[PDB]
Every structure is written in C-alpha cells, then in structure tokens.
Design a binder for this molecule. Structure first.
Ligand code: CO8
Ligand code: CO8
Ligand code: CO8
Ligand code: CO8
Ligand code: FAD
Ligand code: FAD
Ligand code: FAD
Ligand code: FAD
Lengths: 387, 387, 387, 387
C-alpha cells in the first residue's frame, strides 16, 4: 500500500551486474558485431554466467525464478549496450514464456531444466510470411496422427531461429476455417533437431544485425502429443499470455536504446561549441535534450507499471500495450534526434548514434506493431465504458 | 520495499469522497458558474467541510497533515468536475505552502490554524504586470522602516486575489540591482485587512471563468517585521520551494481535465453512428481514443512520481517539472480531440467539451509555462553530465 | 506555360481593398461583436457596397463574375479581421454556388440577381440533427406532387440560416434506402417566406458567435416544381460540386486567422522582455515563430493551388481537401501558439489572441472535418494506383 | 502575369527524360550501388550525355543555361530513383554555382567549359572538422603571397572531394579576428591536383553510401590571384549566394525520396492483406497514406516557389530555407512510414523502403540542418516586422 518507486536491494544488485556488463563488456564489441553481423556467442555465454539470461525459469528447474519487473529492469541495461545482443538473450525468455505459464511439471523440467544447466537458445515461432500482426491467420497445419502430430508449414522472422535447441510452435489444428480463434490453434514445443525442419538463411536487416533472424520450414514434422502445451486448441490463448508477459521487457529494450541516445547526444552537446556558445547553450538544443529526457523518463515508468501490473497478478494487456506503443515510438524519436545533434558526425559510421537509429525501428514492428498496440488499447479502453 | 502502484486504504477513502463530490456536487453546477463567472462559494464551503481543502495544514494545527501525494489524488477528482473550482481551492494550498515549508510555530498557529476554523481563502502573490516566468525580475519592493517593512508595488493575475483573508507576498528587499536572487528577495505574510492595499477588478479570462483572478496594487503597506518568513533574502529560496512542492498538484488537475475530456468523448463515441457504424467502429476514431487514454495514463504517472519524490524528502524539481510540462500539454491535446469527436455538437455551449478546451489552456501558462518547464528539465538533466 | 506565383494588377487591387476594410472598419468592432454576438449587419452592408461579397454571380446575372481564386484572396484578407464576419459573408457564396453551377438561366437571374439588388442572405441546408459528415444519411424528405415538391424535415447547424431570403436544400427523394447517393438526393432552391418553414433559435458557440447559426424545421414546406436545380435525384452531386468549389475559401478563411495569429504574436515578441531579452531573443521563441511562418506559407500555397485547379476547369477535389485539411490543422496550432507567446495576456479577453483561438476550432469540423478530408485525399490518391 | 502551376513544354520534356532515365536505369541498380558503394560512374556519364547534369552552365560557355526551376524539376526526378546518384550529379552544380554568379568571364570559360566537353566533376569545399553550420567559423588560412595566394588548412565531408577536377574553396584571408564575415573570407577555384592537396579516404555513412564523400587537407597550396572569384574580402557573401540558389534543389530531391517512399508503400498497401482485407481498407493505413501525400504535394510547392522567386530575380532566401526545412522534415516522416506499412518486410534489405530511411536522415543535416534552416526563417520573418 502506498506508491513506491524504490527498488529492493536484490533488484538493485541485478541492475548493477547488467549495467557493468553492458558498459565494460558489450559496448566495445557492439559495433564490431554490427558490421560483421556475427552472432554474439561470447557475450551470451557471459550473460548466461552472470545469470542475466533465463531469468524467468522457475527455481525448481535450477532457475533464478525472477519476476517480470526484474527482467525489464535488466533488459533496459543490456539494451543500453546493444539491442541486437539483448534481443538474442530475450529470445530465450519469449520462447520460454509459453512453457513457463502453461507447461506441466514434466515439461518444465525437461525443457527449462536444460536451459539452466547449458547455455542453450530457443525461439518463439508464430509469425508466418502470410501474416504476423493478425496471429489468427497462420496456416501452419498440425495434423493429429495417433500419438503425435504432423506439423506442416513455414515460419518467418524468427528470433534465434537458426540457433535454437527447441522451438515453441503455434499451428492450426482445426481444419475448419469457420473455427473460432479461441479453439482453432494449438501450441507445441518442438525440438530443433527434428527430421523435417529446414532452417533458412540469415536475413540482412537494417537494425539488429547481430541477432539471428531467419525463416524456418517445417515440412512433415512429427511432434509427440506429450509436447502439446495445454490441450488441443488452447494455443492462441497460450500465445496471447506470452506476449502480455513479455511486452514490458520489449518496451524496456526501447528505453535502453533511448537512454543510450540521450547519453550520446548530451555528452556531445556538452563538448561541441558552434556559434561561440556551446551546443547545449543554444535554447533549441537544450529544449531538444529536455524533451529527449522527458520521453525516455515516461517510457521508463510505463514499462515498470506494466510489469508490476503483471507480477501483482493482474491482467496487464492494457498497460503493456500502452508501454510498448509509447516506448517503441519514443525510442525512435530519441534515436534520430541524437544523430541530429551530432550533425555530420552523427550520420557517419564511426559514431555510435547512426547504429542507434537503425536499431530503433524494429521496436515499432516486432512484438506487435505500434498500430496493433493502439488497436488493443482502444479495445481495452472502450470495454470499460461499453454497457 | 519494491515498486507499488497501490493506493493505501486512507487514500482510497479520500479519493472516493473527492470523486463522489465532483461527480455529483460539482459537475452539475459548474456549467452555470462558468457562464456567470460567479465565485463558487458554495462548492468551496462544502469542499472545506468535507476536508478536501487545506489538506497540508499540520495535524497539530487543526489540519489533516496530508502529503503532496494525497493532495494530488484529491485534486485530480475536483478538477475532473471543474478546474475553475479546483484552481479556486488549490490556490489556498499554494498560498499556505511557504508557511508550511518555512514558517515558524507562531506564524503557523496564527495564519494556518485560522483556516481550520472558518472557510477562509488566501493567495500567492508573486507575478507582476511585467514579470512572470522571470521571478527575479519583480519590482515590488519592501524597504525596512524600524520594525516594519513598507511595501510599494503591484501584483498581477493573483488567484483568489480579491477573496482572500491573508496573502503570501514576494517582494524585492535589496536595493542594489546586482544583488543575487538568493538574497535579494523577501517573502512577507500580508493580511488582506491591511490598509494600503488597492484591489483591482475581476479579470475576464476565457478559461477557468468562475475562479477569481485579479490584480492587487500595494501603495504604502507596512508589514510588521514578524511576518517575514525566514528573513531578508530568504524570499527567492522560499518561493522556489513552494513552486516545486506545489507544481505536481497542478499537473494533477491537468490530468483531471484530461480524464474528463476522455470520458465525455468515449461516451459520445459509443453514441453517434455515422456511416451505418458507430464512431467507436471507425479506426480513425478508435486510434484517436486509444492515444487519448495513453496521454492521460502517462501524465497521471508523472505527477504521482513527482509527488512520491517530494513526500520521501527528495528533491522533486526535475520530475515536478517533467510532470507539469507533460500533463499541461497533453490536456490541451485531449481537450481539442474531445471537441473534435463531438464534431458540430462539441463547438456548442450546450456541450461540456468546448469548456474543456478553453480551460486546458492556462495549464501551459501558469505555475510555470511549458516553456520554462523545458528550461528547468534541461538544467536538471545536463548537471548530471557536467564534470 | 511555366509557373507564375504573381497576382494580376486586377487582383492586387481587390487584395488592398479587402485588406483596408478588414484592418479599418472590421477589426475594432469585431472585438465587441464577439462579446455581444449580434449579427454584423452593418459590416455586411459595408462589404456589399464595397464589392467584395457576392463575387461569383455571373456578369450576365448582375454579379462581377469573379472566381474562387479571387474569392480566396479576398476572403483570406477578410478572415484576418474576423472569421465571424467572413463566415457571415461566405454563407452567401456557399448558398449561391449550387444555384450558379447547376441553375437554369431563369433561376440564375431570378435568385442570384436580387442579391445584386440588395444585401440579401442565403443559407446552405445540408446538415441535420442526425447527420452531417454522412451526407448520404440525409433523412429529409421531398415528395413530388407532379408540379410541386413537398419537403418535410429538419436541418440543424445552418450558418446564415436565420437571415436567409432562401436556402439551397438537399433532400432524400427515394424512400427506398437502397437508393444510390448519386441518384437518391434532390436539390431545391426554397424561399424562407414559404409556409411551414419554422426557423430555430440562435446557437451559442465557442467561436464565431457573431455569425448567425441555427436549425430549421421544414414543417410542410411546398416548393414549386421549377425549383429543382438539375433533376429529381441529381442533387447529391450539386452539393459536392458546391463544396469542392467552395473548400479553398474556408481554408483561405483559416489562413486569414493564421496570419492574424502570426501578426499578433510576433509584435508581442518584439516588445515583451523576460530575462533582460525581448521574447524574440530566446531561440525557443524565434524557432516557434519560424514554424508559424512555415505553416501559413504552405497553407497559403495549398489553397492557391486548389482555387486555381477549379478555375482552370480541372476538378480540384484532391488538392482542395488537401488544402482544407492542412490549413484547418495549422490554424489551431498557430492560434494556441500565439496565445502562448502572450503569456497571461494571451489567456486574457482584453487581448485579441483568445478570440482567434476559439474561432479556429470550427475550421476542423464544418465544411468537411479534418478527418473526412484525409478520407477523400486517400481516396483520390489511391485510385491513381488502383485498378 | 498571373498565378499558374502549368509547366512549359520544355520542362515537361526534361521531366519525361529524367523520369525515363531515372526509373529505367537508376532504380534497377541503385541497390547494388548501395551495397557496394561504388561511385556510379556509368550513371554520372549517362546523366552527363542526357543533358540533365550541368544544366546551369550558360549557352555561350557550352551548357544548356537552365534556371533553378528546371534544375529542381530534374533533380526531384532523379531523387525518386536514387538520392546517392542524384547527390553526386548535384555536387557538380554546387561546386560551380559560385562561378556562375561570381566568376569573371575568363574564369567561366576555363572552368565551366572544361566541364561541358567531358564528364568531369567538381566539389564545393566549405565544411571543416570544427565548422560546418557556423560558416564564419572556418579557420583555413589563405595568405596573400604578393602575386598569388597560398592555402593552409583542411576541409571535411566534401561531397565528391576524391573525384573533383577542381574545387571551389572558402578561406579566411583577414587574420585580424575583429574582421567581420563581410570581409574576412575569399573564394578560390583550385585545380584538384595543385601540389599540397592530400585528399583523404572515402567516408562511410549511413545513407548516400555511393556518393563520394571525403575530407581533404591543403598543407601548402599555391593558387593564382586570377582564380580568385570576386577579389580579396568577398567570400562569405559568395558561398551564401550559392547556397541560396542550391537549397531549393536540395529541397526538391528530398521530395523525390518522399515520393519514392510514398509510391512504394502505396503499392504494398494495395497488395498486403491482414484482417481479411488489404491494408488500404484499414483507416489507420489509409489515413497514413493521405498524410504522406499531403506532406509531399506541399513540400513540392515549397521548392517550386522558392526556385521561381530566385529565377524571378528577387531573393528567395526566406523561401529556400522554408522549402529546405519542410522538405527535409517530411522526407524523413515518409521514409519511416514507408517502412511501417511494409512491416517486418520494410526492415529487411530485400526491400526499397529500408534504404530510403537511411538516405533521408542526411536531408536534415546537409545543405543547412533543420534548426539552422529555422533560424533563417525567423531572421527574415521578424525582420519584415521590426522596421
Ligand atoms: C522478448 C524477446 C525479444 C523480442 C523477440 C521478437 C518478438 C516478436 O516479434 S514476436 C511478435 C509476433 N506477432 C505479434 O506480436 C502480432 C500481435 N498480434 C496480436 O496482438 C493479435 O493478433 C490481436 C490482438 C490482433 C488479436 O487477433 P484477433 O483474432 O483479432 O483477437 P481476438 O478475437 O480478441 O482473440 C481471440 C481469443 O483470444 C482472446 N484474447 C485476445 N487477446 C487476449 C489477451 N491479451 N489476453 C487474453 N485473451 C486474449 C480473445 O479475447 C478471444 O477469446 P474469446 O473471444 O473466446 O474470449
Ligand atoms: C492550479 C493551482 C493553484 C494556483 C494557480 C496559479 C499558479 C501560479 O500561476 S503562481 C506561479 C507564478 N510564477 C512561476 O511559476 C514562476 C516560474 N519561474 C521559475 O520557476 C523560475 O523563475 C526559473 C527557475 C524558471 C528561473 O530561475 P532564475 O530567475 O534564473 O533564478 P536562478 O538563477 O535559478 O536562482 C537560483 C537560486 O535560487 C535557488 N533555486 C533556483 N532554482 C531552484 C529550484 N528549482 N529549487 C530550489 N532552489 C532553487 C538556489 O538558491 C539557486 O542558486 P544560487 O544560490 O546560486 O542563486
Ligand atoms: C465559412 C462559411 C462557409 C462554410 C459553412 C459550412 C458549410 C458546410 O459545413 S458544408 C457541409 C459539410 N458536410 C460535408 O462536407 C460532408 C462530407 N461528406 C461527404 O462528402 C460524403 O459523405 C463522402 C464523399 C465523404 C462520402 O460519400 P458517400 O456517402 O460514401 O458517397 P461516394 O461513394 O463518395 O459518392 C457516390 C457518388 O456520388 C459521387 N460524388 C461524391 N462526392 C463527389 C465529388 N467530390 N465529386 C464528384 N462526384 C462526387 C461519386 O463519384 C459517386 O458517383 P457515381 O455514383 O457516378 O460513381
Ligand atoms: C547539392 C548537392 C547535395 C548537397 C551537398 C552538400 C552541401 C553542403 O552541406 S554545403 C555546407 C552547408 N552549410 C550551411 O548551410 C550553413 C549555413 N549557415 C550560415 O552560414 C550561418 O549560420 C548564417 C548565415 C545562417 C547566419 O550566421 P553567420 O554565419 O554569422 O552570418 P550572418 O551574420 O547571417 O551574415 C553575414 C553577412 O552575410 C550577409 N548574408 C547573409 N545571408 C545572405 C544571403 N542569403 N545572401 C547574401 N548575403 C547574405 C549578411 O547580410 C551579412 O552582410 P553585412 O555585411 O551586410 O552584414
Ligand atoms: C528482425 C525481426 C524479428 C522478429 N522476431 C520475431 C520472433 O521472434 N517471433 C515472431 O513470431 N515474430 C517475429 N517477428 C515478426 C513480427 O512479429 C511482425 O513483423 C509484426 O507482428 C508485424 O507483422 P508483419 O511483419 O506481417 O506486418 P503486417 O501484418 O504486414 O502489417 C503491415 C502494416 O499494416 C498495419 N496493420 C496490420 N493490420 C492492421 C489493422 N488491422 N489495422 C491497422 N493497421 C494494421 C501494421 O501495423 C503495419 O503498419 C520479427 C520481425 C523482425 C523484422
Ligand atoms: C553526405 C554528406 C555530405 C556533405 N557534403 C558537404 C559538401 O559538399 N560541402 C560542405 O561544405 N559540407 C558538406 N557536408 C557537411 C555538412 O554541411 C555538415 O555536417 C552540416 O552543416 C552539419 O554541420 P556540423 O556537422 O558541423 O554541425 P555542428 O555545427 O557540428 O552542430 C550541429 C548540430 O547542432 C545544431 N546547431 C548548431 N548550432 C545551432 C544553433 N545556433 N541553434 C540551433 N541548433 C544549432 C545543428 O543543427 C545540429 O543539430 C556534408 C555532410 C554529409 C554527412
Ligand atoms: C488565470 C491565471 C491565473 C494565475 N494565478 C496566479 C496566482 O495565483 N499567483 C501568481 O503570482 N500568479 C498567477 N498567474 C500568473 C502566472 O503565474 C504567469 O502568467 C505565468 O507564470 C507566466 O508568466 P507571464 O504571463 O509573465 O509570461 P511571460 O513571462 O511574459 O513570457 C511570455 C512568453 O515568453 C515565454 N518565455 C519567457 N522566457 C522564455 C525563455 N527564456 N525561453 C523561452 N520562452 C520564454 C513564456 O512561456 C511565454 O510564452 C496567473 C495567470 C493567469 C492567466
Ligand atoms: C458554426 C457552424 C456552422 C455550420 N454551417 C453549416 C452550413 O451552413 N451547412 C451545413 O450543411 N453544415 C453546416 N455545419 C455543420 C458541419 O458541416 C458539420 O459539423 C460537419 O459536417 C461534421 O458533421 P457532424 O458535426 O454531424 O459530425 P458527425 O457526422 O457526427 O461526426 C462526428 C465526429 O466523428 C468523426 N467522423 C464521422 N464519421 C467518420 C468516419 N467515417 N471516419 C472517421 N471519423 C469520422 C467526425 O470527424 C467528427 O470528429 C456547421 C457547423 C457549425 C458548428
């Protein structure tokens, strides 16, 4: 009772670990990995050791059993170093989410347990080239055959896609088009090393070059019915819950990038003199940093509220979509203003800012696009007044 | 311990009392009071007996001894009903702030305890015809003369100016112009019943038309030495403090005016159907309302932080400024969007929304413009990076 | 044959005329008319003799035969003085347009001509209680008694509809709701004197109070057969044609208000001083003015474009709505920005700005709200790629 | 004359040619040049022979002798295909603009003519490591050696510094710090290979990758007094005049990128289906497209006017800075939204929109950043007031 914006000593220490790891271990090689686009294997092994990686995996699976407010708290620190790296680590949590909320005891121990005693990666396969935002459209067929299922399809833009040990899979189990979204799909947990899973090439994208984003083909994949999460048909709902829980940490990724641009821009404004006055002395510039500070702040508090809402055990769809919407948006506003203050240098590859601009954009695309976030928020807002 | 976004039981009770009051007692009559420009004496008196008024006066002074966080939540409600009345009531606490934060026990029993016994009002006198944002530019002087300070000068735009029992007055006490702000000004406690004071006529502003705004000339007003707050020079430092601890409460009322606009708009949106579809079914409007909720949802969190901060004995300046800047601005975007989705009806005096737009305006002018707020945030921010 | 951003010697003349009247005879009284709300009859009587008022009526019908471009530059200057009066004098051109563009020679001389004889008013009756934007949602009836129509209905937000000799009416003729817009509506030139025409009371609005606005219940108003403009059920286009034709003027009307806002605020900026600096010194303010300039410039060039399109015979719809949208939008931004720069004064009635803020609000709703503008621009734009 | 937006047959001609060349030779390779960064010699040469490259060289000297308008008309076309190409093709005009204004006929014959007979290039050197926007801040020392001038210092970000036949240069001739900008600098022409010029490495930037951007060093270069443009003292005013004529052209190209982003997103919105309907059916995607068209049509007019003003003999400064600022601004807004409509796809390199976003950022930095562009508008604006 009574509002409180105070972290608990443990949370404070996690923050200390992540922050140091980002500043002294990530930022130097962030640009190296940006250019080469090479997978951050060294970094993820470290992140794993420092215990900043499968932070949700329950304690009884050898995990830290940390909450969501904690994940966001960390992700914002890792993001300040490099979103391309943070996304990679975050992939595991997004993929582990379905098994964490909805898996049974035997499933939790078999798949979350491995991730704890071995730095393995996993991916969350839902998006199809045919449709990403409208989840209820996916065509990946899952034909029930005996005591197993035959998956059939193709996925697109999957994080850690070609580096996962196993995947979360959402497929259409009910062959009837008329079937309602709430009982038409099924969520499975399919091991990567399965005959029939053709993994596609790495896509070259504009902003998180070191992440493993790939398309993936499932032609006649067999999946044991034991590897069916809740039941046949409760896939959609399981997927929904996963997003609801994970969107705050994604917002936290935005504020991370936002912070970095706020820091970069300021340090420079404080060093560069232009019409004899320092850059920071020109009201225009000072006002920019003011608003850049105003935005990153509000974004910090939005994800916090969202995570706290979930951990308090309240459906957070409303506050999560608000958080993602705003943070991903402003993360893109701050990034550009940074390269703007840095002038001609900001457009150049040697300065950090340019990369921050390229990275920013996906925060308005993956994890639900900004338009979908609005759509959800209006869906939640009106339902309060409706009747 | 950790983060919390939960009000206490006492806060919930207060919030309720406040809400039911604005909802049922203010909202109705506010329409008439706005048109007649008549002071809302009745609504004020009921507020005073309900205890929604001098919620800062110390418990050992007949007061409640509530914090800035408490005043805030109450104010968002009163405002929701009507900002003209809220501002009329909030002015009281602003005037009493310098005494609360810097008056000795005797000045407190006297001027504070007095407001416990009868629904008296008071005002904060600082702004002048040619000096508002630039505090250290006031010219109203107060030269010592034995055991009195004889004060000459006029003040402008003083809220509750013509309906107050006593005043907080900030005047220059150092002749030498070069004398620094942190020792040149002195805050005196003037009784309205004092001879020398010339009270101007009620100014007609477009906004919170039932609130009492007017100018006050001070010809040869003597002030018994004992009414100085800390002493000569303490003025700037004491006014500055009040401003800080009090800004979050005004931003509260901006979010209040915002929440109202949002409500009215969503209710009307679920009413008017245009191309066979209700307004809530047209995506332009849908995204509009979602965005609308967002700006409110965030502004509320900004003042809450600013309030929590100061209550915890922390320097709130930075946040008090961020809150006020963001709250005031968004209220203006929500006012006009509310008028916008009510279309033609919104422009008509029979509909509440047009009033909301006229009112929202002062929120970027008084209590520190959006402009000076940007300046403060910038100053507060850059200092973090100066070495 | 090559671009030309220059007026004809002929046009420059009108500009200077309407400029004088606005900034000489209109401006001073506009202030009082707003506080009192009474119809600016004198000013209309003055504009009429001075020319500038029924500048569309064909030469052969008594009028100057001028055209929308001229109409724009003339009204832009007028609106500078008071949109209230502008909307009053424009109510005529709106009402005349459909009688012009689609009226048989007989009705042309019959109706438009008397306007040449005396300063008479006319209204444009489209909107009604349940619908405005949804034009095809008109429920106003009109039955044919062979050689005489019988109109039953009720219009609502009619400008100049309380001082009109006659009104253009658009009524649903085919009870069958499957009736395609293009064919389901008929346009009548009805006279106020006709029985059954029961005029509503004046509406109090937030802004152009000076202008007369009201509803009209058409009890059993019968209208002689020869009053149909084109032909029973071709009325839907005439209104749209009048629109397109006339939207540049309301835009220009907006631009006039935007200019008044910019003229007013800049003057203040070069007089007011805050930290021992004229307001203009502060880079934040100068950048603000530079943007208010940019907006007026583009809206000016945007309406000058639409006005030209239709004057070159080319259909303007696309460029017109682009203009109405943009101009309207920036009008408000400029009004609220001008207020801001005047500080307390801005929010005060002894000052011009406040009025301008309350006036600019209608420019986003009436004569095609900002939304439907974006709606038709997307329509026109898309079809250029559509097949 | 009289307002006209209709083209000349010849410009309609240039337009068609630039349209064919651009969309039929540039766009199908532009990407490959973005991946390799190879200076597009095949493109430059073909542009040289199509007669859409050194358009401003007068007839007598060999060139087409075209004005600023036709320049923009051709530049805005090429930009649609690729800004990187366009920029190199444009660097030439920038490098020779001063001479055209400012050069005695002897200089013209020898320096613009040497161009008109072979596909040669030329650079415009002004930006330095420590000065870019503050042009009066350049510290390169040009000393008067009795019969010639010696050059000492270094320039930076010189568009096409490694590929220029000759360079225009702006150096500080008056050592006396007190020396006002109006008489401090002088402009020279320098054959690329005068001894002492150490051209640096090609800079790697985020967006006009193929455009040959570098920094040069002028350790001890001899330059004959007959290569001085006007004469000792006149430099700043010459560099300015060049900028003033070129800025509309920089504005035009930004619009080109915008139109390329608009056409690209409009085509995908008409082929991507999401909730059982193509993106165009969603009001959010439809309204986005309208707002993108609006910024384009306007941005187009802003330069079309600014180019006219200058071609009409009257200073275009105020209009150039407006066109440039608004153009560079909306060019960036469209690029991003262009990405947004494509969703995940847009963020991938197999698509155009992504490269468009990387190219747009520079349009708010080179040729006069967005904020200095504002400064100028405010300068000229308040000027026509305070007199
Ligand atoms: C963190 C790691 C680093 C980052 C890794 C990369 C992350 C990624 O990109 S993954 C992103 C993948 N794709 C997306 O996120 C796109 C987002 N898509 C959506 O949000 C949905 O498609 C959305 C909201 C449009 C819904 O589709 P739609 O079919 O219209 O919804 P609806 O009919 O309401 O849903 C179906 C049923 O589930 C329920 N449901 C929907 N949303 C929710 C919710 N939030 N909570 C609970 N139940 C829900 C519905 O209420 C309904 O149940 P019923 O009607 O029986 O009560
Ligand atoms: C709706 C609620 C009911 C009431 C409705 C009506 C409310 C109102 O409208 S009354 C408000 C009228 N006026 C304002 O709000 C004033 C806005 N102006 C300001 O905040 C200030 O003038 C400001 C900070 C922007 C500019 O300060 P400036 O004039 O440069 O003085 P500055 O140089 O900061 O003075 C510095 C000194 O004061 C003190 N000081 C300065 N800022 C602060 C601060 N934020 N916190 C504490 N002390 C401070 C220190 O001693 C400091 O340093 P030093 O000792 O070195 O002098
Ligand atoms: C300052 C003082 C002066 C101002 C005073 C105030 C004056 C006003 O307020 S003016 C009235 C304001 N109201 C409006 O502007 C209402 C706007 N709404 C509309 O225009 C319509 O509802 C609209 C066009 C958006 C959508 O119309 P909808 O009902 O969907 O019909 P739509 O499909 O567009 O058109 C149907 C047919 O009519 C034709 N039509 C409609 N609009 C047009 C047009 N602009 N040009 C040509 N033909 C048109 C269509 O081509 C189609 O023709 P066909 O049948 O041959 O194919
Ligand atoms: C086309 C190919 C693609 C693009 C390739 C890349 C192109 C580039 O980036 S080139 C580099 C671009 N750099 C710029 O745009 C920066 C421009 N800004 C400036 O130079 C300054 O900041 C400026 C002019 C705005 C203001 O300050 P400052 O530098 O002190 O000069 P200022 O005081 O305004 O004026 C000095 C003198 O010049 C005169 N002057 C100013 N503007 C002009 C003008 N537009 N025309 C002529 N004379 C002028 C002034 O009147 C004054 O003269 P006087 O002796 O009568 O006082
Ligand atoms: C690098 C990268 C990594 C990703 N990683 C993952 C991952 O780990 N797992 C995963 O499952 N997915 C992942 N994705 C895919 C991502 O989830 C989708 O991009 C996103 O949900 C959008 O779907 P889409 O790409 O199909 O866009 P589209 O669905 O084509 O949408 C296109 C545009 O239309 C708008 N829009 C769509 N529907 C509507 C509507 N009805 N109303 C209004 N506007 C609408 C969208 O907002 C957008 O502006 C990733 C994508 C990228 C690029
Ligand atoms: C691809 C490319 C090509 C170029 N080609 C050329 C070329 O051919 N020739 C040439 O001469 N130059 C060229 N330049 C350089 C260009 O002119 C500069 O980078 C640009 O003017 C920004 O200058 P800067 O980097 O020195 O900005 P800085 O002066 O370092 O500081 C700039 C930042 O602070 C802002 N700022 C500065 N002063 C103020 C103020 N008083 N008020 C408000 N905001 C202010 C700027 O707007 C921006 O936000 C090019 C640059 C690039 C990247
Ligand atoms: C209805 C109402 C009620 C009020 N109630 C009270 C009350 O109870 N007590 C009291 O003492 N006062 C009160 N005031 C006055 C109010 O506090 C001031 O109006 C406010 O502080 C702004 O000051 P100003 O009007 O002098 O604007 P100015 O200081 O004149 O400034 C004018 C413009 O310049 C901008 N500006 C100034 N300096 C800068 C800069 N450095 N950079 C950028 N922009 C700048 C300002 O924001 C504004 O836009 C009230 C005013 C009103 C209208
Ligand atoms: C002073 C005044 C004078 C006027 N004079 C005239 C006159 O002479 N003649 C005349 O015919 N009318 C006149 N009007 C009315 C004016 O034309 C209407 O207000 C306008 O058409 C908007 O219609 P509405 O108010 O009925 O809004 P509605 O049709 O109720 O629309 C309400 C809200 O929803 C939005 N909306 C509606 N449909 C959609 C959609 N499909 N997609 C997205 N958003 C949508 C609208 O933008 C608005 O925000 C006047 C109004 C005023 C206040």
């Amino acid at each position: 009772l009574g509002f409180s914006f105070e972290f608990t000593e443990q949370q404070k220490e996690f923050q200390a670990t992540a922050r140091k790891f980002a500043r002294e271990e990530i930022i130097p090689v962030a640009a190296e990995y940006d250019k080469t686009g090479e997978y951050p294997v060294p970094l993820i092994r470290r992140a794993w050791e420092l215990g900043l990686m499968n932070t949700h995996i329950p304690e009884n699976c050898g995990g830290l059993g940390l909450g969501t407010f904690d994940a966001c708290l960390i992700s914002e620190e890792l993001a300040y170093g490099c979103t391309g790296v943070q996304t990679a680590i975050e992939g595991n949590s997004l993929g582990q989410m379905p098994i964490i909320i909805a898996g049974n005891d035997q499933q939790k121990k078999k798949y979350l347990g491995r991730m704890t005693e071995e730095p393995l990666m996993c991916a969350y396969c839902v998006t199809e080239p045919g449709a990403g935002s409208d989840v209820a459209g996916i065509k990946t067929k899952a034909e029930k055959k005996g005591d197993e299922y035959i998956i059939n399809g193709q996925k697109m833009w999957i994080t850690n896609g070609g580096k996962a040990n196993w995947y979360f899979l959402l497929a259409r189990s009910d062959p009837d088009p008329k079937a309602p979204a709430n009982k038409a799909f099924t969520g499975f947990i399919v091991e990567a090393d399965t005959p029939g899973i053709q993994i596609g090439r790495k896509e070259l994208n504009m902003g998180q070059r070191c992440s493993d984003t790939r398309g993936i083909v499932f032609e006649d994949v067999k999946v044991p019915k034991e590897n069916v999460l809740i039941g046949d048909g409760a896939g959609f709902k399981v997927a929904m819950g996963a997003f609801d829980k994970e969107r705050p940490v994604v917002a936290a990724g935005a504020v991370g990038l936002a912070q970095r641009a706020l820091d970069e821009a300021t340090k420079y404004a404080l060093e560069r003199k232009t019409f004899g006055k320092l850059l920071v002395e020109h009201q225009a510039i000072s006002f920019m940093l003011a608003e850049m500070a105003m935005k990153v702040e509000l974004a910090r508090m939005s994800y916090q509220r969202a995570a706290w809402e979930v951990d308090s055990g309240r459906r957070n769809t409303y506050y999560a979509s608000i958080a993602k919407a705003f943070a991903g948006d402003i993360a893109n506003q701050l990034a550009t203003d940074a390269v703007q203050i840095l002038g001609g240098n900001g457009f150049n590859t040697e300065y950090p800012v340019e990369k921050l601009m390229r990275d920013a954009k996906i925060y308005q695309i993956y994890g639900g696009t900004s338009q979908i976030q609005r759509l959800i928020v209006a869906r939640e807002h009106i339902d309060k007044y409706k009747n």
